[PDB]
């Protein structure tokens, strides 16, 4: 029942490796990591791969852990109305034109954050249109499938399964094992 | 009395080489070229080494050939009042901050044009302050010594001789042999 220490020091066993491989095969991607807490995953991801010269466009109904993780990095944040795509496209165009505040230099990077299924409304995310917009304007995509994975789709694969979207157009996928798997952790 | 053709085809003799070496040694620089007309020199230089994403700050009393050469390239142009240095520094700072028009991207290059001696006023150019500003803000300098070379300085070397400025802080020097040498051409 006991672990040694962090993963990078002594904490890795073969069970972790098997779990990572099996998750990566299940989702449809090439590789994956597993953590011991979902809140921590969201809180410490954007810190690692973002900065204060990049912009984040997040939905207005996103979970608290995404907001904490984005806040701890430094990037500029703008929000768009829930389930409104013309506004999203308008905002993308305007923010590309304007540039960084106080300098108007080009944005170094733009990331769009969303959720598979918003669990206070019961609605979905317009994944096809999000993929179209990200391919047209060269943005990036991040999807949080906490309530979607395991419980939706013909075979239980999530929103990519639902919309027939190829799980390769989405740059980063994350989820948790807490909801529909009867366990703890994240990936 | 006849020449073959252009310099790049058959037109070069050893006399041209001797003249170029002797001019370069006289001025104090490392190399030089000689042309058959001064107006043409000014008209066809900036075309070669500039573009439409660069800015030029020229004095308001500059000769017509400089204006034609700058016009034929495409670069943005701004002028400052004659013999006013606080205005020049203010303009430099403002134009660095603002950036390109309609895009506000950084200026790719900034060039400052001036004349050794303005031959309608009889005044000089504040060369020390120009060198200070170009070294402080990382601009470039271009000096047109048509009336200065040969006729001013303790030994006839121009405005660099007059102000004791080292003829290395000035990126490009040009002049003519028409005024004080009793000949035709430019360098």
UniProtKB/Swiss-Prot annotation, chains A, B:
Effect seen on changing residue 147 to F: Loss of activity. No effect on interaction with LCB1
What is the predominant subcellular site recorded for this chain? cytoplasm
Source superkingdom: Eukaryota
User: Can you say where in the cell this protein is located?
Assistant: Cytoplasm; Endoplasmic reticulum; Membrane
Q: Subunit comment for this entry?
A: LCB1 and LCB2 encode essential subunits of the enzyme and form a heterodimer. Component of the SPOTS complex, at least composed of LCB1/2 (LCB1 and/or LCB2), ORM1/2 (ORM1 and/or ORM2), SAC1 and TSC3. Interacts with LCB1 and TSC3.
Q: What does this protein do?
A: Catalytic subunit of serine palmitoyltransferase (SPT), which catalyzes the committed step in the synthesis of sphingolipids, the condensation of serine with palmitoyl CoA to form the long chain base 3-ketosphinganine.
Protein name listed in UniProt:
Serine palmitoyltransferase 2
Species this protein is from: Saccharomyces cerevisiae (strain ATCC 204508 / S288c)
Q: What is the lineage of its organism?
A: Eukaryota, Fungi, Dikarya, Ascomycota, Saccharomycotina
């Amino acid at each position: 029942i006991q672990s040694g220490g962090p993963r990078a020091q002594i904490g890795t066993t073969d069970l972790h490796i098997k779990a990572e491989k099996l998750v990566a095969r299940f989702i449809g991607k090439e590789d994956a990591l597993v953590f011991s807490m979902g809140y921590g995953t969201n809180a410490n991801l954007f810190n690692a791969f973002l900065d204060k010269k990049c912009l984040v466009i997040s939905d207005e109904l996103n979970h608290t852990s995404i907001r904490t993780g984005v806040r701890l990095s430094g990037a500029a944040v703008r929000t768009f109305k829930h389930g409104d795509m013309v506004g999203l496209e308008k905002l993308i165009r305007e923010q590309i034109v304007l540039g960084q505040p106080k300098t108007n230099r080009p944005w170094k990077k733009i990331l769009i954050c969303a959720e598979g299924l918003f669990s206070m409304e019961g609605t979905l995310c317009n994944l096809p249109k999000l993929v179209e917009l990200k391919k047209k304007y060269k943005c990036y995509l991040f999807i949080d499938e906490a309530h979607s994975i395991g419980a939706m789709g013909p075979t239980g694969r999530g929103v990519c399964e639902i919309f027939g979207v190829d799980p390769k157009d989405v740059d980063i996928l994350m989820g948790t094992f807490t909801k529909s798997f009867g366990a703890a952790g994240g990936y």
